[PDB]
Design a protein around this nucleic acid. Sequence first.
RNA 1: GACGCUAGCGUC
RNA 2: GACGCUAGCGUC
Lengths: 122, 121
Amino acid sequence: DKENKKLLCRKCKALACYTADVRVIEECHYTVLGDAFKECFVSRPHPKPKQFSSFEKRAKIFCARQNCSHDWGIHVKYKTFEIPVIKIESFVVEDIATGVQTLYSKWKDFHFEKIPFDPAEM
Amino acid sequence: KENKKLLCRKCKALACYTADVRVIEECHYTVLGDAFKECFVSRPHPKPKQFSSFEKRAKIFCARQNCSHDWGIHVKYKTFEIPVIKIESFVVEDIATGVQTLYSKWKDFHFEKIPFDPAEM
RNA sequence: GACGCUAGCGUC
RNA sequence: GACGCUAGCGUC
Ligand SMILES: [Zn+2]
Ligand SMILES: [Zn+2]
């Protein structure tokens, strides 16, 4: 399905983002656009920051719900931007039209409309 | 479908053929024939366990001394002491072409899976 | 053996 | 984050 879909925290089922705001960096990593998502996660300086490829691993990000704090991914410095990078294993994908939920472990198995990251959008 | 060879993934020594492979409970895989018994050695299992219709009695390893790659287990099934192998320990070679394939789980290997028959040899 | 989990470890 | 490896752990 290329239809729009929701991402919920796999632990607490809180809404995180929608597939329409997802951008793909280097056909491998996934980020979310908009400020509404920044409220849904909290970050902490990474216990072991690293530089790889085109990223600066600076922080870990977690579900903002203090009762949850589920690991969602990392926060990196990419080019001139500081953006979050998420892993799908921390989320449940819900089809908006039908409500069907899907548990992915790797992004290669989630087939949705993947918009390439565009710097001009930010 | 076509017959294929299984080589030890570490030392590439031939172990068996898909014709001699039988399936137990559509989940476990054993090898028929006496040629295969020359290809593995056994060692009593560190954590013996009974599960389903199996008594986990030993681990099995490649008989080549410079290899001894872990190949699976050896179990007591019904009235038989038979080996049970895991595909991750082997590389599958096609007979006609020599194309090699590395499988990690049996569910991804598609061939004519003949069910184990206690009457069959 | 099938499968599940955790934990580190390494790579760009 | 993506991938790889290891090591145990749990289930029949
Ligand atoms: Zn949550
Ligand atoms: Zn060997």
